[PDB]
Amino acid sequence: EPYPDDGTGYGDYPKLPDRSQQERDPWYDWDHPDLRLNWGEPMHWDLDMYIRNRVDTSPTPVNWNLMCKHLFGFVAFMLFMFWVGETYPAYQPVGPKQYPYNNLYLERGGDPNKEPEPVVHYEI
Amino acid sequence: SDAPPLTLEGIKDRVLYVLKLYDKIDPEKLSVNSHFMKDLGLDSLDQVEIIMAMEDEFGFEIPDIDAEKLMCPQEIVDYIADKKDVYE
Amino acid sequence: YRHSIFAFTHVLIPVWIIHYYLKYHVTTKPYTIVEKKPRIFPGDTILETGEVIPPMKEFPDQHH
Amino acid sequence: SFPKYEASRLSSLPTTLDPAEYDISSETRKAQAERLAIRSRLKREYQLQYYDPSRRGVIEDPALVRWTYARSANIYPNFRPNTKTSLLGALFGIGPLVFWYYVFKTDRDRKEKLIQEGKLDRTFNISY
Amino acid sequence: YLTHQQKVLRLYKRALRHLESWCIHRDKYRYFACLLRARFDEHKNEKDMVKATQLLREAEEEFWHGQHPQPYIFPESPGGTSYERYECYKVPEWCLDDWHPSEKAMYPDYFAKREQWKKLRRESWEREVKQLQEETPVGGPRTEALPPARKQGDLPPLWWHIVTRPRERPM
Amino acid sequence: TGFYSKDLIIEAANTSYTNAWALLMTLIATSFTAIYSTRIIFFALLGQPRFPTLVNINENNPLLINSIKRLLIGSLFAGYIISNNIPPTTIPQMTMPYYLKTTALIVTILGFILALEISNMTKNLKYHYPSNAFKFSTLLGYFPTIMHRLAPYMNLSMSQKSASS
Amino acid sequence: GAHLARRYLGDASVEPDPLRMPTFPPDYGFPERKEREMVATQQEMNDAQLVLQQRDYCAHYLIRFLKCKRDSFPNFLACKHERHDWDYCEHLDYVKRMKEFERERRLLQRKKRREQREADMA
Amino acid sequence: MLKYIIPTIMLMPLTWLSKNNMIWVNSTAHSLLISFTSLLLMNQFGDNSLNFSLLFFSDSLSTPLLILTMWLLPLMLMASQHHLSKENLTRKKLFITMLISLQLFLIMTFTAMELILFYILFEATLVPTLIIITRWGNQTERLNAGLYFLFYTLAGSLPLLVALIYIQNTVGSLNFLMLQYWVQPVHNSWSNVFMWLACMMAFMVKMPLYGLHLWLPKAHVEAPIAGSMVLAAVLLKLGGYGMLRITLILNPMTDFMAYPFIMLSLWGMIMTSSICLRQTDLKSLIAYSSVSHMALVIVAILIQTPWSYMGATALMIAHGLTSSMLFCLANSNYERIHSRTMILARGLQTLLPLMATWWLLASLTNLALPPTINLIGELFVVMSTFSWSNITIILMGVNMVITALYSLYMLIMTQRGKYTYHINNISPSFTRENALMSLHILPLLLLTLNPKIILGPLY
Amino acid sequence: AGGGAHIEPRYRQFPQLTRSQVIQAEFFSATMWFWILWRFWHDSDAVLGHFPYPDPSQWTDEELGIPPDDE
Amino acid sequence: DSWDKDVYPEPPRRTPAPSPQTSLPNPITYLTKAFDLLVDRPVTLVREFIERQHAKNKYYYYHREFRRVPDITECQEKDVLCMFEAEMQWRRDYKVDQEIVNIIQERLKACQQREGESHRQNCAKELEQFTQVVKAYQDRYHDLGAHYSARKCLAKQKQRMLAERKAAKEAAAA
């Protein structure tokens, strides 16, 4: 079956099935065991894309459309739940843990000139 | 690997030691040459169970395209011999 | 004998080369090896200057 | 009944669950047999040279040569300018270049205003 | 192609492997192996040739729905953890023709025994070609497999690479 | 070893201005740690053997014992030795409700109990119903089967038909 | 966090915001409030190289504990009492900041009743 | 620069007056001696370049390219011995004459002080290069490759000649030292837009710029081994060197004229890397790999920053050693199986263990593994372009991923896997081939220890 | 490799052991429990709790300095 | 001394005296007595041998000093001979200013390591200087481009000075 004559340069090159090389009898004595080809066999136009180190098209236990629904759903729900948890944080009952000397003004790179407005914390 | 080498006779002992616990063959009638269709007429589907027992015994698994061509307790040793490079 | 040979060529000789490199070449230039100044706790004396830091205030502590 | 398997380009239909292997017509048996015929003629030709002892080199593979010749040197003489190639070529060739021009032009035009006016922070920037 | 007899054997062969993957424990495998074994005998005696195919297709379809997503694979098969693990240690036999004489002199006995095989193959080559051409249809061969050795002395045609292939555990 | 790092994290995670869903996910994960650990022990140590008949189950090679032993010693004393020498650099939280201090321990033990029950339930001769939750987790969420089969197909296909030809 | 159910599934006005802790007036309200004193004024803390978050109010305790570790080496099992003292001192600080949480929560509950009275007066 | 020009000329009498069986020995030895003396050009000062006379000078940009040029001729001679074996004596000595006359033009090109003397020698390199491709290439496509290589260069060179003469009439001089002090800013006018294009399009065709590169996959594929080495190691850097010089007299018009050529390079940098993932020819795969790296040099030169120029100079030297090395590797396989298809000879690591070590090191430098000078040059260009526009990190990060994909796919396809059964003539690696790879890789790695001599005038 | 006690791989049966395997294996199993019990005894606070959690419900409005509702 | 102490300041070191409390020995103290005897002393013997050889044949190298020359502002337009010397002098000063920023940066990094956990406070004089020089360096040499020159540096300054005198002039009119 020649490729469609749409003027994309295919010419009279056979259009073999779009099947990966992993979808071949692994036990048949191949002339090229790794490639799973036979000497004198017309090679697929995209043979270099269907080698075993690349795109595979073997049948899957779960239908393609069903897999996409599950994976996206898990990703979609999880992201939504993270947003809910971000705007509703869980914080224990505590106060603004205090620090002395104007809340560590000089320890936190405070500028000695233009001294800060005094801040103090009382016992309780 | 430290796994002891398999001897030509050692394989045969294992092959028959498995066929002798089938509980569907006569131990005194099964020999190195005992066809499963022409000699004692064993069921074809029993070949599948026979081979599966062989595969579960030696570790490696025989192809189905060549498992169907083996009903001869002597041939199994021949096939395994020509698959683990055993010569003595 | 095997350990002594290994502990000599592979430990003692390199630490002579490294130490000679560090002591007389690396440390002759500014800021090649910069240490962290040792922590100074209350009530300690300095080996170099001999200063003494007065201890901290009386602790209003309690048992347990 | 269990849900039927739905194939795709990235997931082929299993051979067992295909209503084309079980039917045994007169054409199928004389067709699946013919494929094995030529497939064996080629293997015989290959086997003769492979096992020959008076040979030291590479067995030329015409199938391999045709594969590479159709991928590099035969594409242009079989190319016709029509409505598909022109449209496919235009948006793959000129498209991205235009798209990346307005992205980088807009970004750098925005940056320049912030630097002339002093609204972009370059306090410690002395490398460029 | 696969004969309808062969398909049932393959379908039965696999169904136990996937079934064995569900049970794990040996005793629970035996209990269900017999049950699945029985379901074949239920329709085994059928001889319609048109309803057996229908069951097989329903059998194949039934197998797919329940097949284990992650079947056990022996670690030397197409999919195991040690498939082609030793392909790098396997080296052709012609590589020894390029050895230096000094390193060839390390094994004086081994290479003397090799020269005999080259003589054995070189002498046998002419007969093997003659055998294949005469025992093959006029229009060319029709299948794989080669004739065995007919007369004494003659060796099976096209035997060199099958006989002298690298070992399965070179090192 | 592990208590001095793992448990001290759940304490800080529980008692922090955190994300509730993230805080929940960690606790569920800790229970899952027990379940697949019990999977290894049960299927690899208990029950009856499933391995082939002729095997060499040998363990007396001196290298193997020595290599395991040192880490075996380290696996017991590493946490105590390290945690009692590294200088303090934070303010660890030591006061908190009872149900938060031990939340790390209850979930893992609870998962341990749950794992043990589910493991034994496989011994019964009741059949199995292939669940989509089972196939989803078995196939790693289908992520290695969509992306690794989709992205290579798109990129490589674009290289030949668009970029080159 | 039991209180979370109140703030997210109850009334938000009564519960205090952890990021908006009491902006209420100064010490007024608690007669004769006592200022919290400090021991390591400026240089003792910036001589043991205490972390910017550790040296809040137990620096004297933390500084004392670090003194024992330096001398007790390699007896890393020693100084246990020193660590316990700092743990207790930190605990009291934890409760003291915890009191402010309940102190404001009830003040919030008190503050709404007066507003409710004015709305319900007519 | 006479101390290097005259020795190079004397190689021609040496080749023709030598014994019929010592042409390869005398030529190789004496060209190596010329290379050793090239290290004297490193007498570089921080303030003033090295000015020899009224015709020739050398600065930090010329020195690394000159030393690279004279180090490549001995390597070309070693690589050409095999396939020029059955060639008759007279034509073999003509082949060496083309190589020497090519080095003679290159060294004078990289040191010409006046910009029209640069043009003459810049264009003079076409003749010897064209003759090597069209006379000693193997395939029937060498003739059409020669025509593509010739007319692409001249279509850009001829407008450049007009632009240079116009500058001399207006400025009064073309001495590069003079232009540094008499340069005036370029006004924005339609006439000045075409002056900019003439001065640059000549150098864009040789880098090459994406779009104008269709000659490179034809010249670099159909040429002999020595043709590919010099084509992809020095001749591509004539355009990059030319741009670095002539951009002095184009400011500030480069601020906006660089936009069309920065987008072609940045997007073309991803098209060329992608094309490598599907190339069915091992030699053509390495050719397209050259367009991707040289796209980084075009971007670096056109944004005119101190970091970009330092990166551009380092990238040019790093690519020359790494690209020439890859061609030699692909040639060694070809000289055995005499075919260029990449999927023909596989699993070669089982039969040629050491030659696969050279494959590994070559690929690591190709994908810019630190701390190689391949990475130093590429990194500096990435740093500079981030300041230009932070979004460029997206495109320069994607190209990094694709670069590692085709670099290691080539390594895996030919070295790993399983060997081809019917290919049985993979003889061991000769000392000539192993030494050829060691003379590419050792200097490439040594430069990592003192990389400041390849960072250019702005170091 | 190593000492190589070379215990023959027995056919269907329990594999052979040695005196060193069990004694050493049992030694560490008892060590784990000894270490687990010894540390649990001395400092059980780390696994159950260090300080009691002060319930704020069982407090008084006076210690907290709440002004009277009557102003 | 090796390097001038003023260029690279270092506050005096204060090593707190040891004060053991435990009865066990300090392993480091004994190692220090084994390192200084089997490593430090043998290395010193070789150095003293090498040092003696140097003193026998002392010879000196001098720090090149550059005579001042007219700046670009004192050169006539298109006067190469006067523009050449002015341009070269500018390039040397650019190199010197690059190293000055390296001296300041080196001092800033040393303070952060020396001061430990209190670096954010004790390192205030260095950081002020680092911001001081970097601002000066940025104005003198930045945005000039790869083909930088004295002329472009002069033009950039004249752009800044004009925008400053205009700003100063119009500030009084506010």
Ligand SMILES: CCCCCCCCCCCC(=O)OC[C@H](COP(=O)(O)OCC[N+](C)(C)C)OC(=O)CCCCCCCCCCC
């Ligand atoms: C405090 C926090 C809660 C603590 C309790 C733990 C959480 C509850 C789950 C415990 C049970 C368990 O994980 O079961 C573990 C079982 C065990 O394998 P099996 O398939 O039953 O048997 C295998 C052998 N066969 C086939 C012969 C019977 O696998 C499963 O479940 C499989 C499904 C896993 C995914 C489900 C969780 C993720 C949901 C999100 C969408 C997939």
Ligand SMILES: *C(=O)CCCCCCCCCCCCC
């Ligand atoms: C408040 O901050 C609690 C945070 C802990 C989250 C886990 C809650 C798990 C509740 C399960 C019920 C246990 C009741 C004792």
Ligand SMILES: [Zn+2]
């Ligand atoms: Zn050859």
